A paper describes a structure:
The penicillin-binding proteins (PBPs) synthesize and remodel the cell wall peptidoglycan, a major component of the bacterial cell wall that gives the cell its shape and rigidity. In E. coli, PBP3 (FtsI) is an essential protein of the divisome, catalyzing peptide cross-bridges between the glycan chains of the peptidoglycan. The C-terminal module is responsible for the transpeptidase activity but no clear function has been assigned yet to the N-terminal module of the construct.
The crystal structure of a soluble form of PBP3, including residues 57 to 577, was solved at 2.5 Å resolution. The active site responsible for the transpeptidase activity of PBP3 is located in a long groove that can accommodate the carboxy-terminal residues of the PBP3 natural substrate, the peptidoglycan stem pentapeptide L-Ala-γ-D-Glu-meso-diaminopimelic acid (mDAP)-D-Ala-D-Ala. The transpeptidase activity of PBP3 relies on eight residues, Ser307, Lys310, Ser359, Asn361, Lys494, Thr495, Gly496 and Thr497, found with few exceptions in all penicillin-binding enzymes. In PBP3, the oxyanion hole, defined by the amine groups of residues 307 and 497, is unexpectedly occupied by the hydroxyl group of Tyr514 that is at 2.7 Å from Ser307N and 3.25 Å from Thr497N. The side chain of Tyr514 is free to easily rotate and liberate the oxyanion hole and should not play a particular role in transpeptidation. Electron density around residues 499–510, a loop that connects strands β3 and β4 close to the active site, is weak but sufficient to allow its determination. The N-terminal module provides three loops (180–190; 202–228; 280–294) and one subdomain (88–165) for potentially interacting with other proteins of the divisome. Because domain swapping in the PBP357–577 crystal would involve a large twisting of the (88–165) domain and, also, because domain swapping should stabilize the domain and hence provide a clear electronic density in that region, the domain swapping observed in the case of PBP388–165 is probably absent in the PBP357–577 crystal.
Residue numbers in the entry:
A (entry chain A), B (entry chain A): 71 to 92, 113 to 118, 142 to 151, 163 to 201, 229 to 536, 544 to 567
Amino acid sequence: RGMITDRSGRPLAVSVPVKAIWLANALNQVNPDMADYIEESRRYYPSGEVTAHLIGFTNVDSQGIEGVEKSFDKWLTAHNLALSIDERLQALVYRELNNAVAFNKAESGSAVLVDVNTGEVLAMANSPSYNPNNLSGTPKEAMRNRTITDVFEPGSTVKPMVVMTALQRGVVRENSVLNTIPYRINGHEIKDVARYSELTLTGVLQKSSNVGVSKLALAMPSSALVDTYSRFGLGKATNLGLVGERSGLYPQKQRWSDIERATFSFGYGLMVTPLQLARVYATIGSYGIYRPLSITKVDPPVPGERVFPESIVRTVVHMMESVALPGGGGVKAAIKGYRIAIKTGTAKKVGPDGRYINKYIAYTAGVAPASQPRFALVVVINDPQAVSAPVFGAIMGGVLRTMNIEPDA
Amino acid sequence: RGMITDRSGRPLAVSVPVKAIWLANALNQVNPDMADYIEESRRYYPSGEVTAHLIGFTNVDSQGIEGVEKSFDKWLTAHNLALSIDERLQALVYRELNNAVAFNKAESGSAVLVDVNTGEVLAMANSPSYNPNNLSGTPKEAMRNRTITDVFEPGSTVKPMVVMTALQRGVVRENSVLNTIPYRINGHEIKDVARYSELTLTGVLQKSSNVGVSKLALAMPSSALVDTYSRFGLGKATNLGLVGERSGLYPQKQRWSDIERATFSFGYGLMVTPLQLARVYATIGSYGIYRPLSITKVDPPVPGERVFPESIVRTVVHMMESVALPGGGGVKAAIKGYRIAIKTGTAKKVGPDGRYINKYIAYTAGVAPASQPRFALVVVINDPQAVSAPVFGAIMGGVLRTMNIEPDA
Ligand SMILES: [Cl-]
Ligand SMILES: [Cl-]
């Protein structure tokens, strides 16, 4: 069985020689020193719970049963496998996410970090996790790689795409001040967190205005946003090769009512995985270049495919900087010395029967450093009892420092 | 300036020290031994014309002006670049293609070879070519990388997709014997090269029946084939990063007449690049796994995305073996000791004014070895005055021998 390593060779799964037995005191997967006092193999996982969801585990016979171990079983069973993951980044991500999940007493949390220039997954973590070196008393719900198996309505994180589309289609000018007074579609209330009489395009992102974006959406054909979200990869498979990998939920509708058109512009009526959202934000970070994702190491250059005009995406990335500046909702994500471009917010959870219950997903997505993004990051916190904004700041701050990126502000 | 090498480090572009001069006998990009008898740089291209279209060239100042030299100019100007190309494969491909173009007195020819498991471009060649070590008296028409810049109607090469779709949608059973008598749609004649009263699904591919496939097409909604050809990458960008890279021509039609529906099933009303066709055939070879292409070296595994059910594609690949067996139109492509799965044929050329003239494109596309494809190959011969079938055999035979693939038949 081949070794799974991180992108620089750091060991993440290593086969370890153990003996089997086919006396009463010793015996009551046997250690070498105890078999002699009286052939098979087992796996050792040096990062343990830090990368458990991604790497998975094998069974008694050394067959892969979950995660990378199962997904690349034939490759491993006989080559090594260098993942795209950077273990320093993985460990810091896990640390911040795990402790944030604990502090807010949430059900779970997930974090994905993507290299903007390559499509590489540099970190992929969830909490609660489990120790793959000892699978015992670990509940099934703590084992899912939620970054790829769980889905949620992306809410405000789609809003930058609404502004890009609307500028692109001449529905609005960079000049424009929008009427953002709350209003009704039938009896459906469209309103923001607070009341704002009017806003700038920047303001529409800065205050995350649902009113603002719904008016942009209704000024264009229903097909516009369907086209833009798809270009950014929403509703499309992420293709890592991982078992349990999901492709979200995506409308397949020719005819849209007015309210549906409005709620699409603020991220309802579709669902994403944390990983698809990371890929949205990597396509924002490259200023409109779509690149396929990879959990295995990849050498640059990766040309990818331009799906949206650079100048439009640069403009909107600038607008997004306001979210993490005073007055913006993501102010708690700010990093001393760095420009960041983020969206933060909230989506109501779906219950057992598929009906909304009173519990929330909190999410922060973004790229840094804003003057030329290198990393796309997504932080999702499930049912904590801008909860995700500080976590994003702490994680992204660590990433920038570890990777020696020149301060920006 | 970085070195461009092949996938194993073989040099394909190397910077060479030359001096400049800012006497009457010597001088009349100066050699080192002559500058001393009395600082800048220039490029040397060891494979010369073999890889000229792909690699391109630089100008006096060492700026990239065509091909890889221009496409990856910023990367090179300072890193080396390992292409996906294997120079042994490139050289044999060029040799067979160049001599075939000469022998049939054709305007040009093009050949693309793709690794079925990785998306890698292993060979990309055209003829006539030119020597990039001396750009002088070389006409502009000999400089285009036609594999990516030229487009043609794919004709019979789409037919295997028609059969896959129709089996998949239950329009036909593997059992079925089809009425393949020539017929009219309005006054439009639908007929094959020769008359066949009836054919098996295999027979429909073996004899490349336009009648057969048009009946399959008309038995299904016009959207079916539009969907299948797109899954295989037709009408979609190839994303190598190469300047002049084209994405073919692709219908954008809600309403199809009967004749249009028929001619789509035998490969008219769209146009492809040799490279897009290579990617179609690589997706056939993987039994329905779509993988993005790469001119740079890529490490396995590459999961890609399943776009069509394996069992259907395996079935049709088997049917395709008949084309290169006695009775099939591609019999001259047969390789002693190997099973191959191919389509061969002809498309009428478009003239200056966009009207059909009496000149032809001949093409052979396929995968080998049929029992588990490793290579997808496309050979296109432009305006020779199954012309491409022997060339395919000779090229693919060389590839299989060079790569040490176990005989198959
Ligand atoms: Cl849940
Ligand atoms: Cl021509």
